[PDB]
Amino acid sequence: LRACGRFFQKHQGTCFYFGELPLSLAACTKQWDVVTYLLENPHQPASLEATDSLGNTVLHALVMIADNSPENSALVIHMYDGLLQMGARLCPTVQ
Amino acid sequence: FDRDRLFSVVSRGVPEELTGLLEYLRWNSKYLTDSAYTEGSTGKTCLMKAVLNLQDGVNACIMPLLQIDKDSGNPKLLVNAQCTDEFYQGHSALHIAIEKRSLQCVKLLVENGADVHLRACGRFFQKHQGTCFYFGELPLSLAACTKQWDVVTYLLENPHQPASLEATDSLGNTVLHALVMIADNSPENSALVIHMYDGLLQMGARLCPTVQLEEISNHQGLTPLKLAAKEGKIEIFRHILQREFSGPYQPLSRKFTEWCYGPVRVSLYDLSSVDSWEKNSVLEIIAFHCKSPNRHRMVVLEPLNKLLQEKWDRLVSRFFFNFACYLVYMFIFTVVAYHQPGESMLLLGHILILLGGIYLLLGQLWYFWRRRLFIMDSYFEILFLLQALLTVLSQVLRFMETEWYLPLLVLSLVLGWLNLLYYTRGFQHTGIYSVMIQKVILRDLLRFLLVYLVFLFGFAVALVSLSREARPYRSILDASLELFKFTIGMGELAFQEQLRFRGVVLLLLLAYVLLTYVLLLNMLIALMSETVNHVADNSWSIWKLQKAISVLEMENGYWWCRRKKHREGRLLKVDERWCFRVEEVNWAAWEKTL
Amino acid sequence: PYRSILDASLELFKFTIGMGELAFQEQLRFRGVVLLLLLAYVLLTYVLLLNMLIALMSETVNHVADNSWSIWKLQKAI
Amino acid sequence: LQEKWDRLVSRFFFNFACYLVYMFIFTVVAYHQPGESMLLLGHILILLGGIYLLLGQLWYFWRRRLFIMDSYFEILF
Ligand SMILES: CCCCCCCCCC(=O)OC[C@H](COP(=O)([O-])OCCN)OC(=O)CCCCCCCCC
Ligand SMILES: CCCCCCCCCC(=O)OC[C@H](COP(=O)([O-])OCCN)OC(=O)CCCCCCCCC
Ligand SMILES: CCCN(CCC)S(=O)(=O)c1ccc(C(=O)O)cc1
Ligand SMILES: NCCOB(c1ccccc1)c1ccccc1
Known part of the structure; x- marks a missing residue:
């Protein structure tokens, strides 16, 4: 599901950009237990190659929400590596 | 049994020696409240001595002392007796008990009939620049300024005589007002005052639910929220504006969170006594009535x-x-000034600057009439008045055909162009840049001028007197002008052979040079010392204060047309209040919450 | 003196370069007032120089010398 | 203190x-140095005043002779 309202779009104002997918939302918020289950559940697994209205994937969304603060950047990097490493299991043929 | 013996035994706390006191009082038909047993210096009674002389928290002499007065048939009460000195008027034994941080004595006095509403209104307790201790004037307010929870609850909910949070002192200040005044901006002090503020406010919802403690106005007409704005105490001022509670004390909140979604929070802020639609609001107090440096x-x-x-x-x-x-x-002013002696347009131009000058004159007179109660923030308001006065005077002079109309017209043109800095505050580009001129730049320029002009006169008189004998400087005005040319870098320092004392005149001119350089370097150093100890963030807040003052003036409209004020926010149920929805996004705070 | 804006602008600018001719010109009827305007221009201009000097001064204290090496590398990178 | x-x-x-x-008085006499009676009176006052400051400062330095920039203006006076 793609939440593409003006509140979720990135702009100068009252907004919360996290990408537009539940997988991207579960990645911007430091929620490991949610993000793995969404990716490897047997009912309907999410795909890291999914893109929002701007074409941003999960890795692109993490970059945009990443500040230069060293508390924020540590979690974004750790989330970045974990999603990238787990992507080698679910979709090895996709870079 | 005289005063000296009685004062000694109550200080030593020996009830066994107090046996003969009752017999002496009955024999002489006297009471403990009589002037004979009170120190004439202040008016201290025998009970006041006992409370400030404590052992193990309870003075055993107090109880026998109180029951003796009851047996003595005193029309007054020793417990309710107060001092009579000018400095310590109204001071009572109950005040001393709370000050000594001894709940047991406070329990003892009220059980025997202590008046919890005694008002210590002496000059020592009144707030003023000097030796004073302002805590309000009631024992309840004293028990609140001192962080004494156990005392303050018992005084409020005791069955003998319960105190009231709605009680007011000589200035009309309640318990909440007193906490605001004694609240410093230190973050150890402000934490206890806020915690005391919430606790008394929450407990007020139990003892007096029908009374709104936050809306009680003192003799100045200020609520506890308005008083914080006037006193410039931001730490408690911020908390009241953003006060939020949950549970049974939810109605006491002023900030109501509507919905929170990640870093984005939506909160309904109460605008009661805050919106500028109502007179004497918080916004008006900060801009005009407040005088603290924290108002920006x-x-x-x-x-x-x-x-x-x-x-x-x-x-x-x-x-x-x-x-x-x-x-x-x-x-129009510049064109008319330049093309001053086709005549019809000049006459029309003269009329417009005459009508315009009156318009600014009436506008500024109306402004100062409204500002007469509280008057550097009005720097341009004074200049806009001067430009109007000179323009009106110049046009009046032109009617009388006096030649001095032109200098006043030209001075008005100079002042009018300089008044254009007032409108730089409307843009973020120019508003922030022009902040650091009135605060430091303009003030220290005046300091150099006054000192320099005095000794410019001293040297000018010296040069003229010394140059009067021949082997330049014919008057003070001339000698002042030549001496000032050194400052602008055009001073003519030459060995003038026309003077008999040619050598000495040069020495005076040289001595003036380095002595003036001392003044420039001192001013440059003075300018220099505040730049290092300066915060760039203040420029953004000071500019917002300039815009805050501006919007409040335009809300009143023009002097010739008073517009109807529009109330901000909307009436929303939260108990319905005129709340104001604020959308706030904070990634840093949200991430720390995760 | 001061026959036009271009002339009057030039004489007023000479004060900034330290060559301003501040004299009591007897040829003018309002000789006293003209001097007051010239004087008022001097301190008012000095306010502008000091404000600019203060503005220049405030970023030097809050400056990092290491940025100069990185900015130069960006210039070479471009 | x-x-x-x-x-x-x-x-x-x-x-x-x-x-x-x-x-x-000093400034007026200095300016109006070459009506003469007031100038003579003005000259006397600055003569008497000069002696007064001279004796006052000599008495000060005599008392300060044991321990002597804090006396900057005492030298100038
Ligand atoms: C558009 C053509 C205008 C031609 C010139 C007319 C005279 C204008 C006089 C003038 O300078 O007014 C300035 C004033 C705004 O100043 P302020 O209140 O911001 O001053 C800030 C001080 N700190 O301006 C106003 O208040 C608005 C103008 C009102 C015009 C109608 C007047 C009717 C009178 C009966
Ligand atoms: C009111 C009219 C006065 C007319 C002028 C009279 C001469 C005054 C001379 C003068 O300048 O005295 C200055 C002196 C104070 O200096 P100081 O001790 O602070 O110097 C500080 C140095 N650091 O002042 C004093 O000591 C007080 C004046 C004494 C007058 C009576 C004199 C009687 C003499 C017999
Ligand atoms: C009009 C906003 C609707 N929503 C926000 C999403 C942009 S919401 O998701 O319905 C929501 C969220 C949180 C709370 C709450 O914290 O009380 C209530 C409602
Ligand atoms: N070209 C427009 C420049 O605007 B100014 C400006 C622009 C951005 C940030 C700060 C200021 C400006 C110019 C002169 C004096 C004060 C401010």
């Missing part, structure tokens, strides 16, 4: 930051229309 | 006022 930091808080921003956006068109009308008026 | 200053603050300004009067 209080206009950037929420909801004031968004409340003033929305007012500015509505009135930004009025600000530029006012700016455009001033540019047109000054464009 | 604050209570001593409050008691002697009137003496400080009286000393200041006497110096302003003395310098006002």
